[PDB]
């Protein structure tokens, strides 16, 4: 076989320890899912500083000096775009999950006009900026990030959460060079199938585009897109307009740069697989088909989780509330009305 006695027992043991971890993690998640936290701060506790990217801006807590990234949602706009459930759900998810590569919700509160989610500030900026700057990541570099996404999806899927918006724009690089997944706006707790057309065009699996329902395997497709884009510098399916992107996705004819390793191409053909009976992450062996793939042979999954692997790139840290790793955005004043708006709709926030 591929493995001697020692290796087979070690791998079997490792896979059983994953099961044990996920069972405890689900117990912890469900307690917070069923009894969410609420109203843990208020707006006058913070100084406004700058917009980082709904709108997210850097703030400073006035008593501790700590900086945070505050997501501000206008209740009226949320209603107008039929986003009430999405915004309640995003906060409910963020307060219930716990994993080292998920950015954490530190406070949440609301007032007459807006909803506020105060999250960890991740000052290294988006993977997107770093990827476009360097062009493409080496395969070891891409693999380090990919391994964190694999573990994060293994975690989320065990909770019956589908993430549905993987892309470099939603991955922040922290001061140790590790990934922080941000934005759970399209995540959904689904035990079987769901149907919503949502996500970002380049990253949609064929079965999201098509009328048929879909499941958590769309996230493993999206991982294939992400690994391809990290290693190539561009995604596997693009075009001038989303409609033409969808046509290419559904055809699924993927071509690879000549510098891709054979192991990488094999992994991507198994993730970017139109046929759901064949796509890695969706088979009898589950996430192990991915974790045990040759391209990941050098990956120490526990060491990645423990954040003990040396990162390939450490962002420049220029100070506590420094913003030099982010783009500049137009600045709006953040207005609060004298009259409460949409109170009944946002009771649970």
């Amino acid at each position: 076989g591929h493995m001697g006695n020692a290796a087979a027992a070690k791998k079997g043991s490792e896979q059983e320890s994953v099961k044990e971890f996920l069972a405890k993690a689900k117990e912890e998640f469900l307690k917070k899912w069923e009894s969410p936290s609420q109203n843990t701060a208020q707006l006058d506790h913070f100084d406004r500083i700058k917009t980082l990217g709904g709108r997210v801006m850097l703030v400073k807590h006035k008593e501790t000096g700590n900086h945070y990234a505050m997501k501000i949602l206008d209740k009226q706009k949320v209603v107008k775009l039929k986003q009430i459930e999405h915004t309640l759900n995003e906060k409910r998810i963020l307060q219930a999950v716990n994993f080292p590569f998920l950015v954490k919700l530190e406070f949440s509160f609301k007032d007459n006009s807006n909803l506020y989610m105060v999250m960890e500030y991740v000052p290294g900026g988006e993977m997107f900026s770093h990827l476009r700057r360097i062009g493409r990541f080496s395969e070891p570099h891409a693999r380090f990030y990919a391994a964190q996404i694999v573990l994060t999806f293994e975690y989320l899927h065990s909770l019956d959460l589908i993430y549905r918006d993987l892309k470099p724009e939603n991955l922040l690089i922290d001061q140790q060079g590790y990934i922080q997944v941000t934005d759970f706006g399209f995540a959904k707790r689904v035990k079987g199938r769901t149907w919503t057309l949502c996500g970002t065009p380049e990253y949609l699996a064929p079965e999201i585009i098509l009328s048929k329902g879909y499941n958590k395997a769309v996230d493993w497709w999206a991982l294939g897109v992400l690994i391809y884009e990290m290693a190539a510098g561009y995604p596997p399916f693009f075009a001038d307009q989303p409609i033409q992107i969808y046509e290419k996705i559904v055809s699924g004819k993927v071509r690879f740069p000549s510098h891709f390793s054979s192991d990488l191409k094999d992994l991507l053909r198994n993730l970017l697989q139109v046929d759901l009976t064949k796509r890695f992450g969706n088979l009898k062996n589950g996430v192990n088909d991915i974790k045990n793939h040759k391209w990941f042979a050098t990956t120490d999954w526990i060491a990645i989780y423990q954040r003990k692997v040396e990162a390939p790139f450490i962002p420049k840290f220029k100070g506590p509330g420094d913003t030099s790793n982010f783009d500049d955005y137009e600045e709006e004043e953040i207005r609060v009305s004298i009259n409460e708006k949409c109170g009944k709709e946002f009771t649970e926030f």
């Binding site: 999405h86 997107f128 476009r132 918006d165 892309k167 724009e169 706006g185 399209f186 919503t196 057309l197 949502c198 996500g199 970002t200 065009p201 380049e202 510098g233 561009y234 693009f238 075009a239 001038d240 989303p242 071509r255 740069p257």
Partner: peptide, 20 residues
């Protein structure tokens, strides 16, 4: 080249989500 086509596509910047 594929890279040149990517540049020409106009989708090299941040990409917005959809929800329909």
């Amino acid at each position: 080249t594929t890279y040149a086509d990517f540049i020409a596509s106009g989708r090299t910047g941040r990409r917005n989500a959809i929800h329909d």
